[PDB]
Design a protein around this ligand. Structure first.
Ligand SMILES: [Cl-]
Ligand code: NA
Ligand code: NA
Ligand code: NI
Length: 698
């Protein structure tokens, strides 16, 4: 077979991640999105779903996507929506998140069991439209929703990411960037590890304390916001830079909850104790009492943030003030979560997650009275009772199950270490105490585990925990239980070594998109090789978002993708105008790219135009200096901006000139070239209009 090949968009249904329960092509032509296509909703709680579509498509395709009456696109809330006809004998769904999409050339009909499911339908629709919907510039092509029949719902109700800002703070705007991609893959839970040995990351005020509580809670963020993970206390490849300091103000935290809610994501706070608790002792003089450790130096009210304290924290398990303080922190987080949900337009019934994570990490024992276990059992007994009296379900890590009998009936273990199927404590929780499990086995879900053998990172769980390790497991089987006992899964972003959103995203992506599939897709509809093939498009969307990602060697679908840009919205400078974008992961430069641009005016013959490729940043793998990771060393190349220089002639025509612009790109690093054809109208030295169809839009 001698000749040439030209790149083509993938089949829309073949792209979908997570893979839906049921997804089939329907008869006839695609639905064409127009600037003024409106959307009808049966209920105001579906406007967040439409907002997610507008946030992308307003920029990428110039769509208003305004709310209207009797629109061709409809979102209907149906609390009885039944997708069980697509659930086989070997399958299991949590129906609250169910949606259906039925589309044809004239109409796009979405039914959603919940407001959350509306957002999931929106995310599916944006994957069907394609991987350029997050373009920061308006594209020349029009957007199409293909004719489909989709019925979908998740296997697991709990599909989460733990973020640790306690080791190293993340500003609100970075958290929003994480939320966008989590929502994109139908993750519904953001677990905030708010407190550690090395930091406390949310403002607690003195409003609404219990009668007689004179604790000055303002000092917690003031003192322990100002500490972070210390590079000097490491002897390894950790960056030379300490963790970022800071904390979310109450107003920032409320915004974080609201933004998460508006993207279908509930907040689950963790205030870890009785161990991993130094920030609480450092922050609040009042907690330095009873059997707390380490103690303040003679004359000081708080213990010093020094290397000797590392690994040696315990709250006072024997002191009333410990539970007073936890109760107040719980009430403050609850108040701010309620305010954030109110600010969102999402229902509290869906977005107020009635769970509190106590952690249950083991305390360091120094003083006498009580062994580690007795003190832990007292702590999780009392702190468990705090969560239950607040109408919530207690979560603890594995270490917490030394207190399995003392935490409330119905409590949850977040499993990360060893074999859950063979763990007597876990099986007692699930079988004897009506408990449930959240699966975060380190080897399948811990992002600091290095994603490749060429990378620098944590090695203990897999050597390298690749997309294969993140994809190829069954959480129900790993837990040795039944579907009904498994809430779901969480990835964990621990920040001992993380100093930037860029360096977090390197570890998070694309492994999070494998966890998303494990959370959502039926066991018997999983196919690692198929998921692997779908990463090429996932990556084009991440580059459009400006999100970093590990270019994993085991992924074989990395590709170059070309999009014609609407030059009507682009400035002509010295005859040069942006007409294309070329997204190819891994480019260390543009010298391996060959562009050809041909302009044919009505009345004229083909004229070669000079092409100026512009790539802001090049691709780099991790960088080390003095045996330590450089912050932001690993970063993705930009999308290439493809400029042409229009002839002086055409730009000096005071009469409108219409022409065809053909651009081709060949890459030395991707063997399938792209060919693009766009019509452009030019008047008074400006591009006035572009179109990629056979006929000029009016
Ligand atoms: Cl089946
Ligand atoms: Na998309
Ligand atoms: Na146009
Ligand atoms: Ni780890």
């Amino acid at each position: 077979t001698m000749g040439t090949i030209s790149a083509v968009a993938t089949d829309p249904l073949s792209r979908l991640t997570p893979r839906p329960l049921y997804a089939q092509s329907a008869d006839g032509e695609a639905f064409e999105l127009k600037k003024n296509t409106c959307v009808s909703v049966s209920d105001g709680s579906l406007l967040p779903a439409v907002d997610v579509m507008r946030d992308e498509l307003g920029t990428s395709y110039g769509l208003k996507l305004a709310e209207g009456t009797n629109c061709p696109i409809t979102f209907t809330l149906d609390e009885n929506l039944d997708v069980t006809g697509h659930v086989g004998s070997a399958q299991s769904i949590t129906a609250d998140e169910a949606y259906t999409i039925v589309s044809d050339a004239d109409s796009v009909t979405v039914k959603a069991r919940s407001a959350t499911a509306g957002i999931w339908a929106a995310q599916t629709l944006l994957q069907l439209i394609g991987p350029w919907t997050n373009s920061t510039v308006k594209l020349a092509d029009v957007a199409f929703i293909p004719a489909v029949n989709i019925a979908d719902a998740p296997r697991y109700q709990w599909r989460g990411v733990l973020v640790d800002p306690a080791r190293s703070f993340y500003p609100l705007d970075e958290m929003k960037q994480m939320i966008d991609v989590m929502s994109a893959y139908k993750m519904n839970t953001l677990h905030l590890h708010l407190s550690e040995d090395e930091g406390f990351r949310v403002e607690i005020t003195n409003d609404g304390r219990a009668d007689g509580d004179t604790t000055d809670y303002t000092q917690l963020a003031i003192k322990s916001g100002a500490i972070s993970y210390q590079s000097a206390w490491t002897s390894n490849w950790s960056p030379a830079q300490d963790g970022r300091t800071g904390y979310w103000t109450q107003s920032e935290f409320i915004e974080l909850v609201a933004y998460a809610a508006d993207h279908g994501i509930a907040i689950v706070p963790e205030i870890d104790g009785p161990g991993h608790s130094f920030s609480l002792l450092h922050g609040l003089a009042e907690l330095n009492t009873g059997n707390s450790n380490p103690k303040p130096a003679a004359g000081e009210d708080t213990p010093a943030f020094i290397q000797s304290a590392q690994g040696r924290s315990s709250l006072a398990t024997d002191a009333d003030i410990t539970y007073t303080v936890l109760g107040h922190i719980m009430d403050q987080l609850d108040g701010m979560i309620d305010k954030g949900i109110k600010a969102s337009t999402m229902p509290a019934s869906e977005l107020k997650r009635m769970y509190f994570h106590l952690g249950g990490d083991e305390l360091f024992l120094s003083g006498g009275a009580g062994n580690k276990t007795e003190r832990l059992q007292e702590y999780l007994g009392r702190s468990g009772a705090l969560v239950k009296e607040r109408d919530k379900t207690t979560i603890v890590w594995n270490d917490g199950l030394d207190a399995v009998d003392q935490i409330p009936e119905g409590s949850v273990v977040q499993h990360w270490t060893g074999n859950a199927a063979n763990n007597a404590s876990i099986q007692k929780l699930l079988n004897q105490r009506n408990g449930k499990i959240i699966m975060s086995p380190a080897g399948n879900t811990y992002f600091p585990q290095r994603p490749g053998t060429e990378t620098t990172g944590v090695t203990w769980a897999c050597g390298a925990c690749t997309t294969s390790n993140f994809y190829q497991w069954n959480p129900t089987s790993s837990a040795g239980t039944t579907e009904d006992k498994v809430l779901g899964v969480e990835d964990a972003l621990w920040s001992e070594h993380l100093r930037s959103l860029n360096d977090a995203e390197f570890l998070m992506y694309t492994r999070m998109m494998a966890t998303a599939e494990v959370g959502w897709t039926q066991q018997n509809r999983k196919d690692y090789d198929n998921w692997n093939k779908r990463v090429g498009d996932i990556a084009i969307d991440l580059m459009n978002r400006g999100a970093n990602f590990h270019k994993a060697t085991e992924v074989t679908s990395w590709k170059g993708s070309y999009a014609a840009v609407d030059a009507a919205e682009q400035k002509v400078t010295d005859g040069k105008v942006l007409v294309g974008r070329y997204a190819e992961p891994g480019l260390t430069g543009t010298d391996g790219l060959s562009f050809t641009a041909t302009y044919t005016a009505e009345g004229g013959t083909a004229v070669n135009l000079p092409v100026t490729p512009d790539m802001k940043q090049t691709y780099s793998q991790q960088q080390l200096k003095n045996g330590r990771l450089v912050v932001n060393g690993a970063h993705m190349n930009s999308i290439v901006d493809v400029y042409v220089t229009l002839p002086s002639d055409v730009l000096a025509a005071d009469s409108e000139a219409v022409g065809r612009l053909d651009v081709s790109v060949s890459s030395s690093t991707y063997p399938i070239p792209s060919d693009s054809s766009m019509s452009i109208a030019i008047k008074d030295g400006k591009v006035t209009q572009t179109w990629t169809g056979d006929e000029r839009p009016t």
